[PDB]
Design a binder for this molecule. Structure first.
Ligand SMILES: COc1ccc(C2(SC[C@H](N)C(=O)O)c3ccccc3CCc3ccccc32)cc1
Ligand SMILES: Nc1ncnc2c1ncn2[C@@H]1O[C@H](COP(=O)(O)OP(=O)(O)O)[C@@H](O)[C@H]1O
Ligand SMILES: [Mg+2]
Length: 332
């Protein structure tokens, strides 16, 4: 019924990466939707994708191109998932979250470094406010490290108080995180405080665990309840859910969820009977995002530099096979 959308976003060279060559090692053609990696010397591999975003691609463009459509399907009542996959330092967190621009030069609302989450949560209150709907928005931020489950929006618990997971009685292909805080967002003003607090707790989590950013998987969920009255006089309810996932660096028990994600994707595309969803917290959590009833997009992030060429290639081969996975999306 529907393929997994795969897009690529390359970042500019960072201060560490040396550009030796006259012309690029990685080229991004947004018209042909291709990436070409130069690796003999006139020798290459070209990969085709659904969208391609080059080094100069601004945040607002990633949002417009990728998320605004997905946010329409969410409002129809589809479950949607976007995950960022790639090497540490390529821009997964910059894409899904973004960064904050110093000393109040921009309201969070206008910040050019703002990423998907903050923009998406702004837009929900604009789109839904005057589309006639009567609605509620609730969000949760969960992170997975060393197969353990940390809640970053819990206002009160020690961040080292980790949560449990069991199979959802009303969804053969999902789970429930017992105790996970779901915060009701009453309007766009409450959004910053909630996300700020979220990012603060993370900092705390970082001090306790080794290389936590790179090894952590982050799952931010927004859920929209929308109720409505039909011409026949009934009461139609639909539940949108959007999963914005920032994955552990492709390069990596610490790695069980990333390993298992690979094994799931491999199984799916090669059409093997057993897809081991159950072998990791992540793949148990996203089971439905990966050959199930969810609309899934991946944003594979890459470097343009020779230093990280091999992880870039890996990341390309890996995201490219994921286009072959078929989901069956369904609403309510
Ligand atoms: C979980 O979702 C989030 C998304 C965006 C923000 C962020 S930037 C967070 C940053 N990537 C970090 O890991 O600390 C931020 C940074 C500092 C202080 C507040 C905020 C809150 C929203 C926001 C708005 C615009 C730009 C960045 C950010 C935080 C959380
Ligand atoms: N698309 C981009 N444009 C400009 N700078 C970027 C881009 N992507 C990443 N960066 C910068 O590269 C660094 C690595 O980003 P980060 O989000 O921490 O990578 P990851 O989460 O993939 O490890 C950050 O300083 C960020 O500011
Ligand atoms: Mg990161």
């Amino acid at each position: 019924m529907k393929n997994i959308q795969v897009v690529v976003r390359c970042r500019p060279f960072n201060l560490a990466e040396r550009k030796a060559s006259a012309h690029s090692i990685v080229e991004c053609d947004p018209v042909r939707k291709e990436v070409s990696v130069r690796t003999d010397k006139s020798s290459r591999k070209t990969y085709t994708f659904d969208m391609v975003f080059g080094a100069s691609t601004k945040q607002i463009d990633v949002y417009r191109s990728v998320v605004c459509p997905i946010l329409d399907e969410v409002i129809m009542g589809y479950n949607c998932t976007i995950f960022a996959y790639g090497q540490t330092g390529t821009g997964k967190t910059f894409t899904m979250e973004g960064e904050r621009s110093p000393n109040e030069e921009y309201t969070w609302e206008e910040d050019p470094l703002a990423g998907i989450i903050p923009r998406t949560l702004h837009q929900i209150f604009e789109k839904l406010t005057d589309n006639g709907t009567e609605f509620s928005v609730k969000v949760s931020l969960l992170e997975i490290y060393n197969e353990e489950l940390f809640d970053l929006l819990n206002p009160s618990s020690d961040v080292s108080e980790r949560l449990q997971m069991f199979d959802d009685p009303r969804n053969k292909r999902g789970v429930i995180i017992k105790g996970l805080e779901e915060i009701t967002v009453h309007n766009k003003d409450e959004v910053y405080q909630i996300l700020e607090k979220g990012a603060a707790k993370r900092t705390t989590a970082a001090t306790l665990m080794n290389a936590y950013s790179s090894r952590s998987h982050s799952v931010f969920s927004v859920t929209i309840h929308m109720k409505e009255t039909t011409i026949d006089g009934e009461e139609l309810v639909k539940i949108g859910k959007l999963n914005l996932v920032d994955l552990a660096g492709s390069e990596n028990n610490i790695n069980q969820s990333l390993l298992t994600l690979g094994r799931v994707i491999t199984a799916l595309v090669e059409r093997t009977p057993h897809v081991p969803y159950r072998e990791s917290k992540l793949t148990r959590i996203l089971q439905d995002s990966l050959g199930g009833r969810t609309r899934t997009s991946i944003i594979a992030t890459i470097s343009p530099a020779s230093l990280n060429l091999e992880e870039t290639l890996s990341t390309l081969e890996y995201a490219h096979r994921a286009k072959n996975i078929l989901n069956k999306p369904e609403v309510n």
